[PDB]
Design an enzyme around this catalytic site. Structure first.
Site, short mmCIF file in Angstrom:
data_model
loop_
_atom_site.label_atom_id
_atom_site.label_comp_id
_atom_site.label_asym_id
_atom_site.label_seq_id
_atom_site.Cartn_x
_atom_site.Cartn_y
_atom_site.Cartn_z
CG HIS A 68 -2.08 -1.06 0.91
ND1 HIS A 68 -2.11 -2.26 1.58
CD2 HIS A 68 -3.13 -1.07 0.06
CE1 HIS A 68 -3.15 -2.97 1.16
NE2 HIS A 68 -3.80 -2.26 0.23
CG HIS A 72 -1.61 0.22 -4.46
ND1 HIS A 72 -2.20 -0.80 -5.19
CD2 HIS A 72 -2.59 0.78 -3.72
CE1 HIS A 72 -3.48 -0.87 -4.87
NE2 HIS A 72 -3.76 0.11 -3.99
CG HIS A 106 -6.90 4.18 -3.84
ND1 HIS A 106 -5.78 4.18 -4.64
CD2 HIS A 106 -7.03 2.93 -3.36
CE1 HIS A 106 -5.23 2.98 -4.62
NE2 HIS A 106 -5.98 2.19 -3.84
CG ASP A 217 -7.82 -0.93 -4.55
OD1 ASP A 217 -6.61 -0.58 -4.60
OD2 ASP A 217 -8.47 -1.03 -3.50
MG LIG Z 1 -7.34 0.79 0.30
ZN LIG Z 2 -5.56 0.35 -2.95
#
Ligand SMILES: [Mg+2]
Ligand SMILES: [Zn+2]
Ligand SMILES: COc1c(C)cnc(CSc2nc3cc4c(cc3[nH]2)CCN4)c1C
EC number: 3.1.4.17
Length: 313
Positions: A68, A72, A106, A217
């Site tokens: 994360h 990403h 995000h 995602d």
């Molecule tokens: Mg997330």
């Molecule tokens: Zn993510």
């Protein structure tokens, strides 16, 4: 005004493809993002000085966690870029502006831990935000950075357009809470089959953008096999550290987060592709036909995990 970002020929060509990998050169990722904003939105969407300062403040507020992280963020933004470019006419000017920014932001200030771990630890964020804990944090961080002097990339919007784009970003970021994906995709599946899906209905658009956010995602599963496999290593590096921290609280982690159950990873991936990824890209492909290459790449990767189990790799 006349200053375009250009990429080397191989990147200029491959960046348009869904399965593009942004590469290991971190210093090129900001320019890759600006390039995507310019082609997707326009060279006038954002003041280049404000955009560059926004991007660098966002980068600084991603942490050095295995998965994360800043890579990403830019990877998820590229998948959104590819969706938007293959669906030229379906999206408003505000939506193209908002969604690339939403994707970049995000996972802002992610600590490498699930909503469940924050709750079991009794982290302060779990008191402030009872549900979608990290995702409400990510949106909070996005607003904080937009409000730094010289960082308001939306300053040239009117008051109502500014309120609309922040609302697009909020919903887009909250939608990355996978707990919410299952219900969202079920509702979209029903609406598409009964034929009641209407892209002029704001609450229907929100659902479709929600699914696009899940699809971007999870886009690790839509890359070429070597990228998918190596990204999985980073995902488990994070998850297994969380499992360790669960054991420290005297809580047995779910097997996905337990390093002692590495051996069952191939079977865990099958369940994930069949329960989450394939259904996600199937519904997305039904709503936005030009996103079909994501579904094809996902099925190819499901086939590779089936080969790992059968001991062929
Ligand atoms: Mg997330
Ligand atoms: Zn993510
Ligand atoms: C972040 O989403 C992703 C992506 C993109 C790829 N892979 C995953 C992991 S999915 C998953 N991995 C597992 C490993 C094990 C079990 C269940 C699993 N589910 C029980 C036994 N061990 C996620 C959660």
């Amino acid at each position: 005004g006349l200053m375009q970002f250009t990429l080397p020929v191989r990147l200029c060509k491959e960046i348009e493809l869904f399965h593009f990998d942004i590469g290991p050169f971190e210093n090129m990722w900001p320019g890759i993002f600006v390039y995507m904003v310019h082609r997707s939105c326009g060279t006038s969407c954002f003041e280049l000085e404000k955009l560059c300062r926004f991007i660098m403040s966002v980068k600084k507020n991603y942490r050095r966690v295995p998965y994360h992280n800043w890579k990403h963020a830019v990877t998820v933004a590229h998948c959104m870029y590819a969706i938007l470019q293959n669906n030229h006419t379906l999206f408003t000017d505000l939506e193209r502006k908002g969604l690339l920014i939403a994707c970049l932001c995000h996972d802002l200030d992610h600590r490498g831990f699930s909503n469940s771990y924050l709750q079991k630890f009794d982290h302060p964020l779990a008191a402030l935000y009872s549900t979608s804990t990290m995702e409400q944090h990510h949106f909070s961080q996005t607003v904080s950075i937009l409000q730094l002097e010289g960082h308001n990339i939306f300053s040239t919007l009117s008051s109502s357009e500014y309120e609309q784009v922040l609302e697009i970003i909020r919903k887009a970021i909250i939608a990355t809470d996978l707990a919410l994906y299952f219900g969202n995709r079920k509702q979209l599946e029903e609406m598409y089959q009964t034929g009641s899906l209407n892209l002029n209905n704001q609450s229907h658009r929100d659902r479709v953008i929600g699914l696009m956010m899940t699809a971007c995602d999870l886009c690790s599963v839509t890359k070429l096999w070597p990228v998918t496999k190596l990204t999985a290593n980073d995902i488990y590096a994070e998850f297994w550290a969380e499992g360790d921290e669960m054991k420290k609280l005297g809580i047995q982690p779910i097997p996905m987060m337990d390093r002692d159950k590495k051996d069952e990873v191939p079977q865990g991936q099958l369940g994930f592709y069949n329960a989450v990824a394939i259904p996600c890209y199937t519904t997305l492909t039904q709503i936005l036909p030009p996103t079909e290459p994501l579904l094809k790449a996902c099925r190819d990767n499901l086939s590779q995990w089936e080969k790992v189990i059968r001991g062929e790799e």
